[PDB]
Design a binder for this molecule. Structure first.
Ligand SMILES: Nc1ncnc2c1ncn2[C@@H]1O[C@H](COP(=O)(O)OP(=O)(O)OP(=O)(O)O)[C@@H](O)[C@H]1O
Ligand SMILES: Nc1ncnc2c1ncn2[C@@H]1O[C@H](COP(=O)(O)OP(=O)(O)OP(=O)(O)O)[C@@H](O)[C@H]1O
Ligand SMILES: Nc1ncnc2c1ncn2[C@@H]1O[C@H](COP(=O)(O)OP(=O)(O)OP(=O)(O)O)[C@@H](O)[C@H]1O
Lengths: 58, 517, 520, 516, 71, 94, 107
């Protein structure tokens, strides 16, 4: 087959979609609650912002 | 330092293998399209996607593919010179010359000189041409029986194409145009009209040389004593085929000075036409409305936008001339027509003549959905009208469909009984190649080729020169009873051209390639 | 300069490398020998295809890079005017002479002994050809056996189907431009043209000059019986330059004045043909519509659009001169012709001009016809090969039987005279006898027979049976003795075939070092 | 056998390349089917489960696999629905010939046998269908809400359904004519309002503006279409405008005025009152001076017309396009009673033209809506409702949905295989097993067992009728006729004819060559 | 094994057993005149046929019940 | 019939190779002597054969060259039976 | 060459069982041409005795005995004609002795 990309189907795209989605939950796992922990937001310039609010994290 | 820097030399062992592999690969390219049940091919150009098209015609494949090998390049244009003068048998001249060289390499492996095979093939060609002379039957009388034989060769030509589904309606129009002609085989008397709308079975026919062009704005619908005069001059505006000339335009009055020069120069041109004493005017270029009003008041029909098929065909169906210049009158022969009727077929203005001198002209009006169907149907009727006009000059016909080929294979085998030894093996090579022509036809239809073709050897040996292959049932039947026959001149032309081009390949033992610039 | 990147070949291996450069040329053309020679595919530089087996087309088109193989190209410039029939014959003879000399080089003999030994045995083979040659036209002239010998050299190609009427044409063309007692036949006085369409039987012999140009008007007369032809460069009209006139007009006062100024020029130079006495006006450029109306009334035809070399080709045959303008018009430079006619060919609009003298002229042109353009260029060379054989017959009416009959009898005399040579050139004389047998051996190999079985049967025939030589059955005829089959070669064509073959081996064997500087 | 030459490996390469197209699109079938995610080259990710978009976004380069792309494109013009289901039918067909080509069967024998299965397969779908009437307005109304309820828009399925039935009745005479053209029903959408504020105009509605012509209201309008750019005198060749003084600068402005007014005076002789100008980008189709000359002659200014909008005009009022001003005649004019500009609160600045009085029947559906996503799916619900009415005109019959004719086709062709002879017995056996993929796909996409559902449904069709099938709403085998899931016959009967000619064309392809 | 088409001979005998005649016809593997091997006297036993389809089916059930070989 | 015709042509080609190898082992042209004998035995003249001594085609009646019939019947039957066994072999079990 | 030509037949999609049926019918026809070409001698035994040296000359071809093949053909025909018995070759005795050429062989 000659197409304009790469094709992949089956249950392997189901397992890759839940591992990419649950990894985002680990970014907002420890920051939940009033005692949530801060997390470093590294920018492309080089500076970092220390935010613990989960709305500003996502 | 013998042949370097682009130069390449094919030796005695190299050019013998290159000429055989290159000719077989072209021969095996279009052997799948052989027969009525042939396969199709995919043709597409490299680097482009809009050129994707599927056609199983043998000439349409070979005209499009580029050829790199020089030994196979003389085989490709051999199928092209069969296509223009005959129009039928393009697939047969390729695969028979390829099968002749496919059995020739078995002889060269058996230590036979190629010039020995040339002298053997020249004797086998005359015996195979004599078998068609004995089996040919003519029809001087019984034109209702001659009408059957024209319909059999029309369906054989129309097979393996797009029109093989509705071929029962097209064979009643292509044969009827031949019987109404009844004379020379000039195909300029028959016109092909391509109009959109309608299916293939909705094709009409006109016996009065129907034209596929509309004329004027307000043309007279009926004219008696139509006097035809054709010309090729520019009548629309100025700068006729002149590029680079410019007129200075300073105001709106300078625009009208161009029109005042246009109204004066066109008035001198119509006065050159009406001094001839004519009643109908045909031109290749468009005619403006102001000389159209001069032609309408004088009672002269102005026919506009004539192509190369317009001037060349109307010069002989009306008895006129080309007459490109009309600067001086009374030096040209004029046409003749009784009545010109305007008929609307396909929602277009169509020009119908009636009562012309040499009134054997006809017109098959084809109907289709788009232009790709009509351009294919225009080629579908063009190759059929060539071989139908061939049978008018020579009404000899032979039984096709493997009957004439197995009779040719039996006639060469009888010549192998009375021959010297070194010419006997070369004539046996001609005998096996003639048996392979109904073999690939039977193999393309999916039948048992070892059961159908090899049974014709035992059938044609002891009399019975009427049985052939019937692809409708897949059983050997009588071709004279079922009505399957072909022409004699086309079947003789595919025998001579496939044997002469096969003589070129065996004569060549060295290919010299120069330096490409 | 440029010592680095330079190919060198010295020592004993350079001698065998020059042999291998010549063995590649001989082995390709040993298959294209005789009337049964195999065809050769030629691939052009732009992509055209033309197939032939002629020897002169092989050597001219073979783009070889070796200088030893380039020396094999040099012989074709002088052989086609001399023999015309053995172009394939001298290449296999120069190659097979080096084949046995390759065996002689293994013994250690110097090539200056082989090149002198080949020249020693060549004088024996030349002297043996004069003893076995038979005359044809001694003490008298005749045209009947000259056509029969011309039918054999012409029918070796694909044009054998119409070899009868074309052989009578080349005999009358040579006898018109040249006399048999003068023995000076000019190839430049015989021209060959051709056009597509027709058959080979429609070949006409035009005693004069032909150009592919029509008249200036279709109402012009097609018959000029008077021998007064004016050949000029400017047409009898108002004067126009060579590329573009570009007349400038301002208004109707300049158009009316230039029309009367042109009407005087339309009346003067048209009537300037009658003051001298000329009838035909061959001009380089065409005529206008006003000039063509005046040429019809005064009965003066004219030829339009005559090219560059087409003007000078007419004035040589008719005896005219290139006149630059109307002021230099004299009656002495006017051309002479017996019949000037226009001949059309069916529906084709060529309409070439046929200028005939209707007498014994000195420049005759041949117009050949055919169904394909590749056959017309083949039939032109086919008649050119026939012109050289008749040229060889005039210089010497003695002929020797070809087809291998002269080659085997020469090999018997050289091998008999080789035993009377008590020096180191004896092996070179026996080498010349073995290489002389290769040309009749390659004739039987191309015919599909056994080459060694066909050769040694004639050895018992030319010795035990009869002392006159017998030929080798190449065209699959009834039996041997091709003298009865009328296949006879010329004596000058057979003597110069031996001499040119010895000349090329002498120049190859003496060369022992090549230095080719490359790129830097 | 030896089998030196291999022309069947290209057939196996043509089958496996077309099999990957149908297998990748197989799980997107049905309403409960899985959606597909695409990624463009710039990085855009768009979620869309419609089969006509994924085949446009796949961008195949193989010549054999490209034949399924225009197969879906021909289904959108002929039937307007049923799109992916033709590909899975044609994809499962080439899977069945893979077992047939290994057995030694030539593909040209399968081509004449699949046409015999097509001629028999049409006959099974004829008598099992339910014939209905086109003049009955209750049948076309009730069958359109049932098909639109499974689409994206279902809360407005009771409103857009009578608007589609009443549009075709002014165009097509019910139960007399057979030809239905969807190009004569133009759907105009603009921002503002709801979908409930809709108008059925019997004439034509344009989306452009009459600026800057200050007439905006004309009676007895003779509409004419001009493709020539009415502008300043422009020459594509080399030209020069000579200048002499300040009075010469006002003369070339008067020359631009007098040249256009000479063209405007030619329009006034034929009685033309409304001018239509084609959209042109390469040059100015209308200058500033030509806008004022038509205002003095009370001629309405209409420009910026697409090529597809020209087709809607000539079938409405009978106006023929002209290429130049010298060919402008009186015969190429239309007919109109009134032309004006109506600017509503939600309909926008549109040109409402009523009073056609011309040979030709076209309608216009003006749909309003607040958001941009509202009106685009309203047009997709209309075009899905316009196709089920066009499918009912050419075939006056109805069938059940959920793959119920596909199971009946697999059972009757098996009984037809016992009465045939020759090679055609096994090809119609493979034709019957290739039709069972469509209920097996709907069994897998509904969450049921793919084998246990189609096996129980075959025994229900041997004893009963086509009422048994797969109901995706309740998730199980039920009565499709009682579930009111009814599809037209032209969706399925053209899905068999178009897939059979593609399989016959693919199997007939022997070798693939490249030219130059 | 008889040197004919394996599918064309098979699909024409099964058509002969349904369309024109209800009793079964055989396949002329010996290249005899025609079908209906009762006239050709080709007769097999019933117990040899009832156990042919039995022991072939029971060997499939022994194979389909085996899903692991450990050595 | 059809499929039996190609098999009979292979049997006639195998019997033509027996004078071909004898003519090839004797050094003579095997493509000329055997191919002339096929045309000689085609239309009558069922007496001429091969002559190894003179190296041409001669009459076997005057030359005195003949063979026994029971040996010629034994070789033709054994070679057709030996080719009958191996042609039916499609599998080797070792 | 029987298996060499039949090897190309399996390449032409021909079953080997049909080739044997084509060879079994060709075997009866080849024996039929051998029966028509068989020339027996019911009388004229002096001409039949001349044919017996042709059988001895054909069997002794391509051997070492070509130096004196004419002498061995005369001794071969005198052993069988004086026997007039069955095909058992125990009645003849073959002696292996040195000395002498092939032409001095005794009977
Ligand atoms: N109905 C038929 N029955 C038997 N043989 C047929 C039948 N139709 C065609 N043929 C055979 O097919 C051959 C022609 O092959 P094919 O149709 O592939 O080329 P063609 O279309 O004639 O070539 P062209 O495209 O130049 O006309 C003929 O020689 C004829 O014997
Ligand atoms: N009919 C014939 N029978 C036998 N030998 C012949 C016959 N005709 C010509 N020959 C021999 O063939 C030789 C010519 O060979 P060939 O045709 O290869 O050269 P050619 O092509 O004529 O040369 P060129 O290229 O200069 O025309 C002659 O020397 C002649 O002896
Ligand atoms: N309301 C429904 N209830 C049950 N099945 C349905 C319903 N609507 C459609 N189907 C089934 O789903 C299939 C079509 O699924 P899908 O929606 O993916 O494609 P489509 O675009 O509607 O049609 P096509 O695939 O022909 O273009 C049809 O074969 C039909 O049998």
């Amino acid at each position: 087959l000659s197409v304009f990309g790469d094709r992949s189907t089956g249950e392997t795209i189901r397992s890759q979609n839940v591992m990419a989605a649950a990894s985002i939950a680990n970014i907002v796992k420890s920051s939940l609650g009033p005692v949530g922990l801060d997390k470093m937001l590294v920018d492309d310039i080089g500076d970092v912002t220390i935010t613990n609010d989960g709305a500003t994290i996502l | 330092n013998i042949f370097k820097a682009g130069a390449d030399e094919e030796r005695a062992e190299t050019a013998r293998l290159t000429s055989f592999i290159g000719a077989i690969a072209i021969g095996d390219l279009v052997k799948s399209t052989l027969g009525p049940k042939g396969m199709d091919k995919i043709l597409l150009s490299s680097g482009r996607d809009a050129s994707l098209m599927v056609t199983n015609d043998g000439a349409t494949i070979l005209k499009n593919i580029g050829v790199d090998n020089p030994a196979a390049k003389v085989l490709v244009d051999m199928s092209r010179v069969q296509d223009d003068e005959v129009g039928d048998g393009t697939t047969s001249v390729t695969v028979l010359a390829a099968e002749l060289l496919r059995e020739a390499e078995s002889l060269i492996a058996k230590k036979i000189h190629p010039q020995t095979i040339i002298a053997g093939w020249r004797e086998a060609t005359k015996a195979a041409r004599e078998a068609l002379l004995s089996s040919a039957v003519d029809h001087g009388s019984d034109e209702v029986k001659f009408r059957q034989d024209l319909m059999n060769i029309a369906g054989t030509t129309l097979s393996s194409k797009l029109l093989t589904h509705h071929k029962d309606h097209f064979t009643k129009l292509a044969v009827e145009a031949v019987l109404r002609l009844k004379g020379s085989g000039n195909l300029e008397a028959i016109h092909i009209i391509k109009k959109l709308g309608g299916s293939l079975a909705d094709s009409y026919l006109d016996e009065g040389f129907l034209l596929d062009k509309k004329i004027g704005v307000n043309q007279p619908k009926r004219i008696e004593n139509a006097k035809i005069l054709i010309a090729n001059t520019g009548m629309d505006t100025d700068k006729i085929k002149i590029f680079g000339s410019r007129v200075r335009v300073d105001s709106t009055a300078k625009v009208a000075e161009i029109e005042h020069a246009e109204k004066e120069k066109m008035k001198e041109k119509v006065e050159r036409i009406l001094k001839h004493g004519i009643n109908c005017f045909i031109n290749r270029q468009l005619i403006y409305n102001y000389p159209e009003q001069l032609f309408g008041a004088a009672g002269v029909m102005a026919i506009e936008h004539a192509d190369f098929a317009g001037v060349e065909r109307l010069a002989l169906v009306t008895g006129g001339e080309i007459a490109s210049t009309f600067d001086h009158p009374e030096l040209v022969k004029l046409g003749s027509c009784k009545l010109i009727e305007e008929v609307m077929i396909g929602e277009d203005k169509l020009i119908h003549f009636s009562g012309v001198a040499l009134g054997e002209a006809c017109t098959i009006v084809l109907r289709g959905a788009t232009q790709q169907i009509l351009d294919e149907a225009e080629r579908s009727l063009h190759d059929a009208l060539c071989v139908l006009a061939q049978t008018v000059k020579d009404s000899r016909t032979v039984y096709g469909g493997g009957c004439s080929e197995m009779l040719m294979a039996h006639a060469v085998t009888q010549l192998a009984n009375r021959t010297p030894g070194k010419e006997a093996v070369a004539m046996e090579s001609y005998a096996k190649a003639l048996r392979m022509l109904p073999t690939i036809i039977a193999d393309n239809a999916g039948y048992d080729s070892a059961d159908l073709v090899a049974q014709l050897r035992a059938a044609h040996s002891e009399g019975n020169t009427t049985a052939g292959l019937d692809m409708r049932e897949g059983t050997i039947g009588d071709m004279a009873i079922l009505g399957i026959t072909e022409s004699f001149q086309v079947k003789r032309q595919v025998l001579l051209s496939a044997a002469e081009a096969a003589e070129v390949i065996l004569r060549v033992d060295n290919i010299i390639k120069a330096a490409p610039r | 300069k440029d010592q680095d990147r330079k190919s060198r070949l010295m020592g004993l291996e350079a001698l065998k490398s020059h042999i291998m450069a010549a063995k590649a040329v001989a082995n390709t053309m040993r298959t294209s020998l005789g009337p049964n020679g195999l065809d050769k595919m030629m691939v052009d530089k732009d992509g055209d295809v033309t197939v032939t087996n002629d020897g002169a087309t092989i050597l001219s088109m073979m783009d070889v890079d070796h200088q030893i193989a380039k020396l094999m190209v040099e012989l074709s410039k002088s052989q086609d005017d001399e023999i015309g029939d053995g172009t394939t014959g001298v290449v296999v003879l120069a190659g097979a002479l080096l084949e046995e000399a390759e065996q002689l080089l293994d013994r250690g003999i110097h090539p200056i002994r082989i090149a002198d030994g080949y020249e020693q045995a060549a004088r024996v083979a030349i002297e043996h050809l004069d003893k076995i040659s038979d005359s044809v036209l001694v003490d008298i002239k005749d045209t009947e056996p000259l056509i029969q010998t011309a039918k054999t050299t012409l029918g070796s190609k694909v044009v054998n189907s119409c070899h009868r009427q074309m052989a009578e044409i080349a005999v009358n063309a040579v006898l018109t431009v040249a006399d048999m007692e003068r023995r000076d036949v000019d190839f430049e006085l015989i021209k060959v043209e051709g056009k597509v369409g027709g058959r080979l039987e429609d070949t006409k012999l035009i005693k004069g000059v032909i150009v592919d140009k029509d008249f200036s008007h279709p109402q012009m007369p097609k018959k000029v019986e008077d021998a007064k032809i004016a050949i000029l460069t400017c047409p009898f009209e108002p004067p126009k330059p060579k590329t573009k006139h570009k007349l400038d007009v301002t208004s109707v006062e300049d158009y009316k004045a230039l029309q009367k100024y042109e009407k005087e020029k339309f009346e003067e130079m048209i009537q300037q043909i009658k003051e001298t006495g000329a009838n035909l006006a061959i001009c380089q450029w065409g005529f206008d519509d006003e000039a063509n109306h005046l040429l019809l009334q005064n009965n003066l035809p004219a030829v339009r659009w005559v090219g560059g070399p087409e003007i000078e080709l007419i004035a040589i045959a008719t005896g005219g001169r290139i006149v630059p303008r109307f002021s230099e018009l004299t009656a002495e430079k006017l051309g002479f012709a017996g019949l000037v006619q226009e001949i059309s060919f069916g529906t084709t609009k060529d309409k070439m001009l046929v200028i005939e003298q209707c007498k014994n002229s000195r420049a005759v042109t041949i117009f050949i016809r055919g169904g394909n353009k590749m056959i017309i260029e083949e039939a032109k060379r086919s008649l050119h090969d026939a012109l050289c054989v008749i040229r060889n017959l005039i210089r010497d009416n003695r002929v020797v039987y070809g087809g291998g009959a002269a080659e085997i009898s020469c090999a018997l005399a050289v091998s008999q005279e080789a035993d009377k040579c008590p020096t180191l050139e004896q092996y070179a004389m026996r080498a010349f006898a073995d290489a002389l047998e290769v040309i009749p051996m390659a004739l039987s190999e191309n015919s599909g027979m056994n080459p060694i079985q066909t050769m040694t049967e004639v050895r018992a025939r030319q010795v035990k049976e009869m002392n006159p030589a017998l030929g080798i059955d190449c065209l699959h005829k009834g039996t041997n003795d091709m003298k009865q089959q009328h296949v006879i070669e010329t004596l000058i064509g057979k003597k110069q075939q031996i001499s040119l073959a010895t000349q090329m081996v002498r120049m190859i064997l003496k060369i022992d070092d090549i230095r080719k500087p490359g790129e830097s | 056998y030896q089998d030196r030459d291999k022309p069947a490996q290209i057939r196996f390469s043509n089958i496996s390349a077309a099999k990957a197209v149908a297998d990748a699109i197989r799980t997107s079938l049905g309403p409960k089917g899985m959606d597909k995610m695409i990624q463009d080259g710039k990085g855009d990710v768009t979620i869309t489960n419609d089969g006509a978009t994924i085949l446009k976004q796949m961008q195949v380069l193989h010549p054999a696999a490209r034949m399924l792309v225009e197969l879906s494109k021909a289904q959108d013009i002929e039937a307007g629905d049923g799109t992916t289901s033709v590909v899975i039918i044609a994809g499962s067909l080439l899977d069945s010939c893979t077992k047939l080509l290994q057995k030694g069967i030539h593909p040209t024998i399968i081509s004449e046998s699949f046409q015999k299965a097509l001629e028999k397969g049409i006959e099974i779908l004829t008598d099992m269908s339910r014939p209905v009437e086109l003049s009955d307005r209750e049948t076309l109304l009730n069958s359109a809400t049932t098909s639109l309820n499974s689409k994206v828009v279902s809360q407005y399925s009771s409103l857009l359904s009578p608007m589609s039935v009443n549009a075709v009745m002014k165009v097509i005479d019910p139960a007399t004519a057979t030809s239905v053209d969807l190009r004569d029903i133009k759907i105009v959408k603009k921002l503002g309002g709801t979908i409930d504020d809709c108008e059925l105009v019997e004439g034509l509605v344009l989306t452009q503006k009459v600026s800057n012509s200050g007439i905006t209201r004309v009676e007895k309008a003779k509409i004419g279409l001009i493709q020539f750019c009415l502008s300043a005198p422009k020459t594509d060749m080399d030209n020069q405008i000579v200048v002499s003084d300040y009075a010469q600068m006002d003369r070339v402005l008067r020359e631009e005025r007098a040249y256009i007014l000479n063209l405007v005076k030619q329009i006034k002789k034929t009685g033309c009152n409304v001018l239509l100008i084609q959209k042109s980008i390469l040059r100015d189709a209308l200058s500033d001076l030509a806008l004022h000359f038509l205002n003095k002659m009370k001629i309405m200014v209409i420009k910026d017309i697409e090529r597809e909008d020209i087709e809607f005009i000539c079938k409405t009022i009978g106006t023929k396009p002209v290429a130049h001003i010298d060919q402008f005649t009186a015969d190429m004019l239309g007919s109109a009673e009134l032309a004006e500009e109506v600017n509503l609160n939600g309909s926008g600045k549109l040109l409402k033209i009523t009073g056609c009085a011309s040979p030709g029947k076209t309608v216009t559906i003006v749909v309003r809506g607040s958001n941009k996503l509202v009106i685009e799916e309203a047009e997709r619900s209309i075009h899905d409702a316009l196709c089920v009415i066009r499918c009912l005109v050419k075939k006056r019959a109805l069938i059940a949905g959920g793959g119920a004719p596909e199971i009946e086709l697999a059972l009757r062709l098996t009984e037809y295989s016992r009465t045939l002879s020759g090679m055609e017995s096994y090809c119609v056996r493979a034709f019957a097993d290739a039709m069972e993929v469509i209920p097996s796909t709907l069994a897998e996409n509904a969450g049921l067992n793919p084998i246990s559902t189609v096996t129980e449904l075959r025994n229900r069709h041997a004893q009963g009728e086509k009422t048994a099938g797969i109901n995706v709403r309740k998730g199980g085998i039920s009565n499709i006729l009682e579930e009111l899931v009814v599809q037209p016959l032209l969706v399925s009967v053209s899905a068999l004819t178009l897939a059979t000619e593609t399989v016959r064309s693919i199997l007939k392809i022997d070798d693939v060559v490249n030219t130059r």
